[PDB]
Amino acid sequence: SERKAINKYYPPDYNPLEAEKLSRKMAKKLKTMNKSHASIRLMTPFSMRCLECNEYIPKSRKFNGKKELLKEKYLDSIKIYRLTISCPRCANSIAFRTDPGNSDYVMEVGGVRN
Amino acid sequence: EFLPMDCLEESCPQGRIFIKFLFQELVNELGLDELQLRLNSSKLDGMFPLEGDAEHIRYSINFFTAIGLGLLTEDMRSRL
Amino acid sequence: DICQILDGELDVLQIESVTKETVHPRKSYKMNSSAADITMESVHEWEVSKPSL
Amino acid sequence: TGVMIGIDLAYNMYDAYGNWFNGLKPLIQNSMRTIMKANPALYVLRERIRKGLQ
Amino acid sequence: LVDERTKQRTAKAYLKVSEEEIKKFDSRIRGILMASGSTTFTKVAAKWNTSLIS
Amino acid sequence: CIFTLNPKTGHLFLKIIHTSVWAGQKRLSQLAKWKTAEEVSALVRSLPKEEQPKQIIVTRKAMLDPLEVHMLDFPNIAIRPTELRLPFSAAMSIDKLSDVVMKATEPQ
Amino acid sequence: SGDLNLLKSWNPKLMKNRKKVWETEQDLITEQQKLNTRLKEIEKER
RNA sequence: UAAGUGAUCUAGAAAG
RNA sequence: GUAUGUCUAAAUGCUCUUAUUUACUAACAAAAU
Numbered sequence: 001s002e003r004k005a006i007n008k009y010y011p012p013d014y015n016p017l018e019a020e021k022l023s024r025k026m027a028k029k030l031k032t033m034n035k036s037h038a039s040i041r042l043m044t045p046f047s048m049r050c051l052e053c054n055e056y057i058p059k060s061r062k063f064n065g066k067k068e069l070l071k072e073k074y075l076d077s078i079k080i081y082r083l084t085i086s087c088p089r090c091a092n093s094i095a096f097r098t099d100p101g102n103s104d105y106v107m108e109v110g111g112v113r114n
Numbered sequence: 115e116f117l118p119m120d121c122l123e124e125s126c127p128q129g130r131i132f133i134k135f136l137f138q139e140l141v142n143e144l145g146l147d148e149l150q151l152r153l154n155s156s157k158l159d160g161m162f163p164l165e166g167d168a169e170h171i172r173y174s175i176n177f178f179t180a181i182g183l184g185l186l187t188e189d190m191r192s193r194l
Numbered sequence: 195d196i197c198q199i200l201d202g203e204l205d206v207l208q209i210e211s212v213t214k215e216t217v218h219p220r221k222s223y224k225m226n227s228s229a230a231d232i233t234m235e236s237v238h239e240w241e242v243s244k245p246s247l
Numbered sequence: 248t249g250v251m252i253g254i255d256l257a258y259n260m261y262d263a264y265g266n267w268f269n270g271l272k273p274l275i276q277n278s279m280r281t282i283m284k285a286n287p288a289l290y291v292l293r294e295r296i297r298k299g300l301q
Numbered sequence: 302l303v304d305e306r307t308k309q310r311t312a313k314a315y316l317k318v319s320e321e322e323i324k325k326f327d328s329r330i331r332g333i334l335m336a337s338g339s340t341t342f343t344k345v346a347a348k349w350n351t352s353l354i355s
Numbered sequence: 356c357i358f359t360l361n362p363k364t365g366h367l368f369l370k371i372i373h374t375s376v377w378a379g380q381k382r383l384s385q386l387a388k389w390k391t392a393e394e395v396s397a398l399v400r401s402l403p404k405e406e407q408p409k410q411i412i413v414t415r416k417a418m419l420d421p422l423e424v425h426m427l428d429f430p431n432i433a434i435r436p437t438e439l440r441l442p443f444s445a446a447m448s449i450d451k452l453s454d455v456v457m458k459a460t461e462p463q
Numbered sequence: 464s465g466d467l468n469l470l471k472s473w474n475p476k477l478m479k480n481r482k483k484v485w486e487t488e489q490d491l492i493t494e495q496q497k498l499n500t501r502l503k504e505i506e507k508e509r
Numbered sequence: 510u511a512a513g514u515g516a517u518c519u520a521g522a523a524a525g
Numbered sequence: 526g527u528a529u530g531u532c533u534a535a536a537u538g539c540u541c542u543u544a545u546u547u548a549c550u551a552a553c554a555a556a557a558u
């Protein structure tokens with residue numbers, strides 16, 4: 001019952017491998033886990049303007065974003081991500097990408113950096 | 115703490131310097147004249163041999179001179 | 195691995211059959227109790243030693 | 248009558264105890280040694296440990 | 302203490318870390334301890350060493 | 356098969372893996388790698404100190420670690436990777452070898 | 464605390480990620496160099 | 510002629 | 526300290542991949558020789 005709980009109770013018949021298999025079988029059917037744009041909490045490094053309503057969301061402002069994987073990676077084996085945000089006033093989907101060549105981000109049809 | 119009991123031409127490289135060092139230490143601790151007196155009090159034939167022994171004490175005297183000390187001259191005078 | 199080894203050296207040690215028992219999955223990590231993992235039938239009668247290392 | 252093979256995963260020590268018949272024991276020992284040198288699972292475990300420790 | 306003329310160890314001088322210095326040390330230790338709920342054990346240890354060495 | 360070729364003398368130490376090895380098994384590829392490593396080790400053991408290798412070269416990338424593990428007894432023998440996608444996967448394309456592989460009732 | 468993003472995997476400004484990227488570049492770069500030289504040699508031959 | 514006997518704190522769980 | 530709130534009428538088995546993690550959480554804490 002307590003966040004540092006050592007052992008979760010299992011039923012008396014719990015073939016772990018079998019259980020895993022079952023879960024897998026019922027993971028394609030599952031709504032969540034079988035989808036993109038999984039949530040995340042992030043502060044905004046770019047400090048940018050929301051292109052619709054010009055709301056000047058500043059640096060380090062916290063948002064409940066959606067992180068999604070971009071299939072087209074950078075180079076070969078180092079992934080890059082789309083990080084969706086909403087502007088506070090108008091609900092326009094701002095987002096950005098993390099191209100690690102410059103050790104920084106790229107704006108993605110959301111707003112503009114300034 | 116210890117009793118001054120000490121067993122000392124041929125025997126003079128490292129050993130001689132060690133002896134010198136010891137003497138210096140003694141001087142530092144005691145006080146020159148006092149130290150000398152103390153030495154005299156013990157039998158002490160090795161550090162200061164009293165008998166002249168045909169210019170064998172000359173070496174000892176020289177050694178003593180090398181590290182600032184007294185009584186050597188007196189000893190020398192005594193023997194002639 | 196043990197089973198494989200047994201299979202490899204069946205007739206050398208006079209082994210009829212090497213049965214890997216269908217234990218309960220957690221038997222690996224039941225430290226209180228235990229169970230025979232690899233039961234081992236003989237062809238002729240084995241003359242075993244006392245419990246030793 | 249039987250044997251209890253035992254492998255200390257955190258020290259990589261192994262030992263077994265129980266009943267034996269003629270010619271078995273050396274072979275068993277050899278097998279154990281082989282396993283310790285290279286079992287896949289054990290190797291994996293070792294790797295994991297290394298990773299943890301860096 | 303030595304007389305420079307005669308080279309005699311003519312006096313003694315006993316030492317003790319003044320209470321103020323002790324207090325300072327204690328304060329330093331406290332500081333090291335305080336503001337260290339996170340810190341990598343090693344960092345803390347290093348700090349302690351530094352203090353102690355000083 | 357386990358194609359083990361000495362490029363100096365042309366000695367192909369071909370271990371024929373039998374179908375009875377894979378009976379009632381899982382995580383099969385991994386197992387196979389381990390088996391291969393074991394075989395290699397055995398081969399090394401068999402070879403005397405004069406005839407033993409220096410660089411055991413491996414074709415694939417992920418045949419290194421198991422081999423290394425198995426070859427801790429022989430630290431003098433280095434295990435080498437390669438950029439070359441070498442064509443020893445066409446050992447079964449050779450006829451006689453293929454035939455031999457087919458006609459095996461044991462590990463050989 | 465201040466900047467949250469610093470405790471995220473995806474953040475590229477995180478140092479680990481940067482290191483990884485560098486490693487990737489370094490390996491790839493090396494490969495390119497190896498190939499580049501070969502290419503140059505070929506050109507020369509031609 | 511006589512050294513060398515004994516004094517031994519602790520000790521984890523939750524939430525924040 | 527892993528926030529939160531509104532919203533609710535009464536195909537089957539199969540196997541194969543792993544020396545990893547699109548991992549998530551930051552309420553917690555922050556210095557040198």
Ligand SMILES: [Mg+2]
Pocket residue numbers: 525
């Ligand atoms: Mg509170």
